[PDB]
Write a protein that binds this ligand. Structure first.
Ligand SMILES: [Zn+2]
Ligand SMILES: [Zn+2]
Ligand SMILES: [Zn+2]
Lengths: 48, 96, 210, 49, 48, 125, 170, 481, 196
């Protein structure tokens, strides 16, 4: 009943039923979560 | 004997109840680990557990060796029968 | 109590507010930023005797905003509960000084008329009010705190222009926020909120003051 | 109890309980009480033949 | 013991569920990405 | 005055009024410089036997060794011990237990009551 | 070096302090006069307080308690022989004086027991079975969860305390 | 980027969910192109550099006509661009990946294609998706037993009741809590931490007293309490001129030396506390800690003059006997000798070897764990706890989101709720997408106001009339509308 | 249907409210009607006041049938006519030799002196019952009927069984007092022997 008020918009910004902006873009990237995957960055490697 | 040493930041009873619990857990785990060894790879059960189906070693413990301690909210069964659980037990009994 | 440690509080709050002023853009001297408590006692010649006027000594002018409007003022009232009487004398002092901004730091409570008079003050002048215990710890030192930047009206103009953003659409920010009180932000103004992103690496948002 | 054991006292109804801790003997003959039959052990042995 | 497949050819490795699906690093997720739902559904029906 | 003495003054919980069996109340005789005890409902009043009229914060003593008649010993479900000599009677069958109450007794230490006739003694080891 | 003062109360405290040093003849055997020592202690309290404060009087009183002790006469004696100068003795730096014989022992063991009260919180677990590839040490913890759950198989989850690593039996 | 990355992840975990597994994609090129370690690795490194620079341009999510949008473009893509830049290094391509330029060139087209794919559909009702994304893990074992030991108290009651309460935004948690960090030596010195423990911990006067008793004492110095008799008698420097009229009645309290061991306390602190609270009107005297027992015997300051039935006022201003009880009733129950007056009296200990935290950078640039003493407390006086010396105001947090709003504000709230929801989620161990949790916090905070997003706050909302009426009240919103 | 056993006084904590402890017993008639006759003795946790008496938390305040508010147990004892504290104490315990039991009851004794007369006590209880005008015969007479019939019917509503009635209440308080002192263990609600 709470979360039904919100949807994604075509300008990538996340907005509500009264068109106000929730986010600059959905998940701060606008990309699909399904296309996300677990990865090691490994740049936090111990020795410089 | 009251010669038992209470755990720091805990009561002697809390230590005692904790201490008996480690033992009942270590033994069951040890006897469980014996059963994990004791089973052939030929077994359907080990086959079922390994495959990632609906089974595990704890099951083997429960089916073959030992179910383990029953508890109430994680605590040993309370003395609902006047400082006892049942009239089959002696008063002040603390057996598992 | 109130014998030595108090100096540490007065030192730390003095640094917190100076860093605050420094953060406001005012060119606080690095040494003022850098000074120690031992030096702080030394700088004020603190504690030749007890029950003196450190709060009168703590009272200071702040000076900077690369934009030379100059002259912000900070006053520490001696009374825990401040009355209009001290506010009028203060009003006289700020008027006589013709300062641009006055910050008054109160220890405890205030009369509602003084509270009112502080709120209204003057349509063309601002008076600032800070409670000493809330100053006693710098909240912006906290790890959960994002970076807040006040936006120029033109930046706001450019922001709306670039997106075609409606004023309503912008998330509001309540002026009841201590941090809002920290920036001295005014209603209708926008603050730039800089956050780390676990997704983007960097996330920037904005809220208009309500 | 011997009257209880003699069936001159209704075992099916008459309950008789003593608490040394309270220095009390309570007895109840009201309806709705649950009871069950048990073997009577005497001298760590069964009374039955 | 350890699982390894090359050019659609299984070199070694007894299979598990973490391989078989509903988890990260699963064959199912990457087939969905490369082969797409349509090829993956026919493979899945076929294997079963 | 030494850290080896004790404080058992034998506090006087109450004394009834001879006129009504009601409690007598403290009072000073500022004229005679002496403590007195009086009933409220009547004119009955009498001098005090001690300067102490009050005590506070309780229970730092061995209650469980008290308030326990040896008649517990008749309970068969209470275990006898093979440990002999009723601290009195040269006979075993001492009955034993913890405190078993509210302070329920982090003291899991056994407390011994001989069940042998002619002693009734409650101790512990 | 007898320090004379003009204040009657100070002298009166000095007389009271001289009286406290009279305890148990030790001043005789050492041969030091109680009045001079009593006068030097009060002056020293005064050298710091510079006023007949109740708290100043309190220091005399804490000094009184230390003087009037009978379980540590060697304390008085250490003071009397100049090993603990009156200006030092007054200058506290002894944490409720009780050195020699037992309260110090008690004080140490008390410092031990209150130190012990952090030592283990109230719990435990560690298993030390699974190696952690982030630190080679088998400093790991294990989980028994997913009694039934859904289609996901019941797993044993292992977490490494140090360097935070968690992985599954599967 | 490596230097920046240390800031972004203080946990030092480099394993994150991200789009497009380039390793698998790069590997597939090798499987396709048939590159092997016994074949030469012909490559033009500048092409690699340019390919990354061009692909970076391809990473468009917003216009690039102005630098701010580009800055918006740059920061939003920043983390991915670092994964991309770290992966697509010239040395990696030639040495580790041994890719050919053609293999690299085909791969670039593939990566971009993967990028084009990652884009979510505009118009999406992701919000309904997120509500379901919260609802499903709530169904699991969020309430299944307090399995947590962690050398401490069970705190901050697991799951749904906290989740229900959280949704209900109860003014105060059912189980408030606060984690006390220790700066410098306190993290390594127990003795320092205990000194903090003594300073922080709540202490009532009733907590401190061994016993109390009321006595009739003819003479303050020739007391009837003969054990204390030299102790009173020896005192004389006390103004005993106004004590010739003070309460003839004696009140005496016995103090727990065990408590003095317990909280590390002293008599002088106690006497000065009592007088400051009650004022000058209460006379206070005590024996030394080296005595047989700690006792404190008190008197009322009957200041000689008008305090002697001066104006009758047939009221009996106060009887003595009863007044010793009113003070004692008040003495035990009211006075707090030490501590915050709502934190009960807790500070459970944990060795920071507990979790992946306080991981610190070193000269080598490698991450290392820092062990420490910590207390987990039940309490929420965030101003007071922040105000405490030696405790770290930076890391110190509390389970109460309300104090975060009150002190740090709604922005800090957005993060703490985010951490806490994640924390409940971390307990169930079932991964849930983070973006949604980030999204959820935005929804509650979008107003900048802390309020129940439930029906308990709908009337304050600016939402449409059909929405509010849909919340079962119907007619009331509709009549007003 | 599972119910709790009647005519059996049980003590439970009421710490969720201003009441430190509670002792309850229902006193329904054996056959006549089984009206229930629920009795509450609740220990009030008003551990404090101000400058009034520094110790309100030792009050007990009985909960009488039909009465518009709660009243001290000791007031009932005055209505029973036992004006002598010694007599009430025997009613409380045959062994007052324990000072601890004596000190705990002492604050209830302080309450007893505001009303000594049985007649005033009956009118008092009646005044708490309702307002039949100034006719304080009726409040007493009503109190008399409640004391006989509405109070502990299970022992008998006969006049001479009022003194006899008094003997049960003191043990009931005593049982409460042991548990309130802590000497008694807290009664279980889950126990079936305490159930019917
Ligand atoms: Zn009398
Ligand atoms: Zn014997
Ligand atoms: Zn590890």
């Amino acid at each position: 009943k709470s979360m039904e008020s919100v949807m994604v918009k075509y300008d990538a910004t996340v907005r509500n039923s009264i068109n106000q902006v929730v986010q600059l873009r959905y998940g701060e990237d606008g990309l699909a979560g399904e296309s996300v995957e677990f990865q090691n960055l490994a740049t936090l490697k111990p020795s410089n | 004997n009251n010669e038992l040493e209470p755990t720091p930041g805990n009561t002697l009873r809390q230590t005692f109840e904790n201490q008996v619990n480690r033992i009942l857990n270590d033994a069951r785990d040890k006897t469980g680990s014996s059963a994990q060894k004791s089973l052939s790879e030929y077994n359907n059960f080990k086959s079922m557990v390994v495959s990632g189906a609906k089974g595990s070693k704890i099951n083997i413990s429960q089916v073959i060796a030992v179910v383990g301690q029953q508890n109430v909210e994680g605590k040993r069964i309370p003395f609902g029968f006047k400082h006892r659980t049942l009239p089959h037990f002696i008063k002040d009994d603390y057996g598992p | 109590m109130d014998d030595e440690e108090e100096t540490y509080r007065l030192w730390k709050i003095r640094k917190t507010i100076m860093q605050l002023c420094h953060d406001r853009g005012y060119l606080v001297t690095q040494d003022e930023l850098d000074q120690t408590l031992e030096e702080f006692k030394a700088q004020s010649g603190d504690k030749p005797s007890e029950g003196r006027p450190r709060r009168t000594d703590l009272t200071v002018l702040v000076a900077h905003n690369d934009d030379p409007t100059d002259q912000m003022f900070v006053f520490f009232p001696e009374e825990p509960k401040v009355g209009i009487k001290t506010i009028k004398v203060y009003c006289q002092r700020m008027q006589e000084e013709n300062i641009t901004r006055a910050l008054i730091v109160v220890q405890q409570g205030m009369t509602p008329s003084a509270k009112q008079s502080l709120v209204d003050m003057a349509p063309k002048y601002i008076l600032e009010q800070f409670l000493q215990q809330e100053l006693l710890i710098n909240i912006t030192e906290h790890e959960l705190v994002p970076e807040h930047v006040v936006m120029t009206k033109e930046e706001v103009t450019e922001l709306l222009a670039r997106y075609k953003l409606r004023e309503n659409q912008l998330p509001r920010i309540q002026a009841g926020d201590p941090v809002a009180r920290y920036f001295g932000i005014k209603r209708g103004q926008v603050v730039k909120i800089i956050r780390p992103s676990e997704t983007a690496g960097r996330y920037i948002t904005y809220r208009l003051v309500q | 109890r011997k009257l209880r054991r003699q069936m001159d006292i209704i075992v099916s109804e008459v309950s008789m309980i003593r608490d040394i801790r309270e220095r009390e003997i309570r007895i109840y003959t009201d309806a709705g009480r649950i009871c069950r039959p048990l073997l009577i052990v005497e001298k760590q042995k069964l009374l039955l033949k | 013991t350890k699982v390894v497949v090359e050019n659609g050819e299984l070199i070694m490795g007894i299979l598990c569920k973490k391989s078989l699906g509903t988890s990260a690093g699963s064959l199912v997720h990457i087939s969905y990405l490369e082969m797409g739902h349509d090829i993956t559904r026919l493979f899945y029906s076929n294997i079963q | 005055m030494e850290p080896d003495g004790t404080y058992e003054p034998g506090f006087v919980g109450i004394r009834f009024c001879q006129e009504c069996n009601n409690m007598l109340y403290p009072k000073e005789d500022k004229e005679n410089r002496i403590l007195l005890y009086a009933c409220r409902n009547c004119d009955y009043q009498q001098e005090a036997d001690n300067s102490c009229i009050y005590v506070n914060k309780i229970t730092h003593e061995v209650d469980e060794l008290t308030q326990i008649i040896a008649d517990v010993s008749q309970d068969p479900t209470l275990p006898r011990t093979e440990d002999h000599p009723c601290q009195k009677c040269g006979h075993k069958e001492a009955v034993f237990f913890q405190s078993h109450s509210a302070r329920a007794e982090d003291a899991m230490r056994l407390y011994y009551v001989c069940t042998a006739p002619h002693c009734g003694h409650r101790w512990t080891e | 070096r007898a320090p004379s003062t003009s204040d009657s109360v100070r002298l009166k405290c000095r007389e009271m302090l001289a009286a406290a040093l009279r305890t148990g003849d030790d001043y005789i055997a050492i041969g030091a006069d109680e009045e001079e020592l009593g006068s030097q202690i009060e002056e020293a309290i005064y050298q710091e307080i510079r006023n007949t404060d109740m708290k100043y009087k309190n220091r005399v009183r804490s000094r009184i308690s230390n003087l009037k002790d009978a379980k540590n006469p060697n304390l008085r004696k250490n003071v009397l022989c100049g090993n603990i100068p009156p200006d030092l003795f007054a200058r506290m730096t002894a944490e409720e004086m009780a050195s020699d014989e037992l309260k110090e022992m008690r004080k140490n063991l008390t410092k031990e027991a209150i130190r012990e009260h952090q030592m283990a919180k109230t719990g435990g677990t560690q298993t030390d079975l699974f190696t952690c590839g982030k630190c080679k040490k088998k400093n790991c913890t294990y989980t028994q969860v997913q009694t039934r759950s859904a289609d996901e198989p019941m797993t044993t989850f292992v977490v490494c305390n140090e360097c935070g690593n968690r992985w599954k039996f599967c | 980027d490596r230097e920046v990355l240390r800031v972004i992840f203080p946990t030092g975990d480099s394993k994150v969910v991200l789009p497009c597994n380039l390793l698998r994609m790069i590997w597939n090129a090798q499987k396709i192109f048939h590159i092997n370690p016994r074949l030469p690795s012909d490559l033009h490194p500048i092409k690699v550099v340019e390919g990354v620079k061009e692909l970076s341009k391809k990473l468009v999510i917003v216009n690039g006509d102005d630098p701010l949008s580009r800055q918006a473009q740059e920061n939003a893509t920043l983390l991915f661009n670092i994964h991309l830049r770290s992966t697509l290094c010239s040395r990696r391509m030639a040495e580790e990946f041994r890719l050919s330029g053609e293999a690299f060139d085909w791969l670039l087209g593939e990566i971009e294609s993967k990028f084009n794919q990652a884009i979510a559909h505009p118009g999406e009702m992701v919000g309904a998706l997120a509500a379901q994304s919260l609802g499903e893990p709530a169904t699991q074992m969020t309430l299944n037993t307090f399995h947590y030991a962690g050398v401490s108290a069970k705190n901050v009651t697991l799951g749904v009741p906290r989740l229900k309460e959280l949704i209900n935004i109860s003014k105060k948690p059912k189980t408030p809590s606060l984690t006390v960090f220790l700066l410098g030596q306190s993290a390594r010195d127990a003795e320092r931490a205990k000194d903090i423990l003594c300073r922080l911990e709540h202490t009532t006067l009733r907590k401190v007293t061994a016993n109390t008793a009321i006595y009739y004492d003819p003479n303050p110095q020739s007391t009837v309490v003969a054990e204390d008799q030299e102790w009173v008698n020896v005192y004389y420097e006390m103004p005993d001129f106004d004590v010739a009229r003070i309460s003839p009645w004696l009140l005496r309290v016995e103090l727990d030396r065990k408590h003095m061991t317990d909280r590390k306390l002293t008599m002088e602190q106690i006497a000065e506390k009592i007088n400051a609270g009650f004022g000058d009107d209460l006379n206070c005297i005590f024996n030394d800690d080296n005595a047989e027992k700690l006792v404190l015997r008190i008197r009322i300051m009957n200041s000689d003059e008008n305090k002697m039935q001066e104006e009758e006022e047939v009221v009996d201003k106060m009887d003595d006997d009863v007044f010793l009880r009113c003070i004692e009733s008040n003495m035990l129950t009211d006075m707090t000798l030490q501590g915050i007056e709502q934190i009960s009296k807790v500070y459970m200990h944990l060795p920071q070897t507990d979790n992946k935290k306080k991981i610190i950078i070193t000269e080598d640039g490698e991450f290392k764990a820092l062990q420490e003493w910590i207390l987990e407390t039940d309490g929420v006086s965030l101003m007071r706890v922040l105000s405490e010396k030696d405790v770290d105001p930076v890391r110190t947090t509390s389970n109460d989101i309300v104090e975060i709003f009150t002190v740090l504000g709604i922005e800090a709230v957005r993060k703490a709720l985010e951490r806490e929801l994640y924390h409940v989620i971390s307990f169930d161990g079932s991964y849930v997408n983070y973006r949604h949790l980030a999204l959820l916090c935005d929804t509650m905070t979008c107003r900048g106001h802390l309020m129940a997003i439930t029906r308990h706050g709908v009337n304050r909302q600016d939402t449409g009339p059909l929405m509010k009426c849909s919340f079962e009240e119907t007619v009331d919103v509709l009549m007003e509308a | 249907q599972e119910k709790m056993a009647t005519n059996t006084v049980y003590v439970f904590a009421k710490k969720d409210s201003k009441y430190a402890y509670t002792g309850e017993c229902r006193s329904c008639l054996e056959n006549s009607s089984r009206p229930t006759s629920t009795i509450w003795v609740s220990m009030l946790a008003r551990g404090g006041q101000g400058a009034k008496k520094s110790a309100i938390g030792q009050r007990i305040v009985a909960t009488l049938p039909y009465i518009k508010q709660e009243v001290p147990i000791i007031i009932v004892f005055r209505a029973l006519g036992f004006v002598s504290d010694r007599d009430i104490l025997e009613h409380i315990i045959y062994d007052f030799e324990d000072p601890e039991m004596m000190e705990m009851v002492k604050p209830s004794l302080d309450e007893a002196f505001v009303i000594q007369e049985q007649n005033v006590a009956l009118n008092f209880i009646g005044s708490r019952g309702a307002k039949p005008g100034v006719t304080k015969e009726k409040r007493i007479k009503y109190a008399k009927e409640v004391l006989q019939k509405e109070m502990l019917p299970h022992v008998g509503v006969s006049d001479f069984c009022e003194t006899k009635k008094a003997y049960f209440l003191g043990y009931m308080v005593h049982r409460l007092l042991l548990a309130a002192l802590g000497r008694r263990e807290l009664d279980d609600r889950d126990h079936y022997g305490n159930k019917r």
